[PDB]
Amino acid sequence: PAAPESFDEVYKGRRIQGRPAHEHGGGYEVFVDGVQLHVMRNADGSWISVVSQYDPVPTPRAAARAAVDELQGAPLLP
């Protein structure tokens, strides 16, 4: 499958970024305020992440936004 497009935006006050590229070897990378958020693509082309692991979302940007939603302001840890 094609790699998703990169993105860069401020969402709920935090900078979220995505780009094509202990954990699998990532084909796509997401960052929240510069700290990497581990994300993974599912067979059906949806995504999850460590911060929201059991609830598929359609895109890496959706996973970034879901992570920022759940973090409620907390810094991510590498």
């Binding site: 202990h22 954990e23 699998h24 067979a43 911060v51 929201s52 059991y54």
Partner: protein, 278 residues
């Protein structure tokens, strides 16, 4: 070893389970289970090597992980066994599971912090150490991100599926394993993680002790499936790249195969498990 429905524990059994879990936390042993789980759920991938999740070995892998945890609990209090949470039956926030004498309740709405029970951060007895963000307090949002826990009718519809698993042996599969895991269909295991919320909905989900009770019920459902389908068994049985075949060993232990874990009775029984019937 009899694994009991959580709702049926006596007050003394609840006390002894809680105390053993808090001692595994105090001694540093608990957190290494969280870390192992995190490592596998971040590594198991639909297009490559997959052992603990998204694959046929999801069920034997979690069976051996829960045995390692129960053995650690028995090393503290030999009387303790892992209880299970039948979320089809005990499906509201008022269930005794969530009382302050057992796991404590939901998180408060501002920051999702659990405020009562033995695992509340205010106790000083449940630091969240293995984590993905700065917060070090247990969080939950019961029923917050998804409305309802699975029902028994939904569980029965999954137990009725005859094939243990099916190619391509990942989150896209038809078959029992992937319906129980929940990536396709009505969704059992994944949805329960989402329903609890907080750390339980993340890749460090054993930070919530309810992790073990949920997985012990998922483990029971595998046993129930086997009683419903004595004629049907683990697949695949050989030569499958990236997937653990029946006679291959599983990481991280390497000394056990799915074949060694199909029959739970070599290790424990349940309070109740129907024999095969029609």
């Amino acid at each position: 070893t009899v694994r009991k429905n959580q709702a049926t524990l006596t007050a003394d059994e609840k006390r002894r389970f809680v105390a053993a879990v808090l001692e595994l936390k105090r001694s540093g042993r608990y957190d290494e289970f969280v870390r192992t789980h995190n490592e596998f759920i971040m590594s198991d991938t639909d297009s490559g090597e997959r052992t603990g999740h998204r694959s046929p070995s999801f069920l034997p892998w979690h069976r051996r992980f829960l045995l390692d945890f129960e053995q650690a609990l028995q090393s503290v209090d030999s009387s303790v066994t892992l209880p299970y949470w039948d979320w089809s039956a005990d499906r509201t926030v008022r269930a005794s599971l969530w009382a302050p004498d057992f796991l404590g309740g939901t998180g408060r709405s501002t920051d999702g912090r659990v405020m009562d029970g033995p695992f509340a951060a205010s106790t000083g007895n449940w630091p969240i150490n293995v984590r993905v963000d700065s917060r070090t307090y247990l969080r939950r949002s019961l029923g917050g991100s998804v409305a309802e826990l699975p029902t028994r009718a939904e569980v029965e519809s999954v137990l009725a599926i005859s094939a243990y698993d099916l190619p391509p042996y990942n989150s896209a599969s038809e078959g029992f394993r992937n319906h129980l895991e929940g990536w396709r269909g009505v969704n059992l295991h994944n949805r329960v993680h989402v329903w609890v919320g907080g750390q339980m909905a993340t890749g460090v989900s054993p930070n919530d002790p309810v992790f073990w009770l949920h997985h012990a019920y998922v483990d029971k459902l595998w046993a129930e499936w086997q009683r419903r389908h004595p004629d049907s068994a683990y697949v695949p049985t050989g030569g499958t790249p990236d997937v653990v075949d029946l006679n291959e060993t599983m990481k991280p232990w390497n000394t056990v195969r799915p074949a060694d874990l199909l029959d739970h009775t070599a290790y424990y029984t349940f309070d109740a498990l129907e024999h095969h019937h029609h």
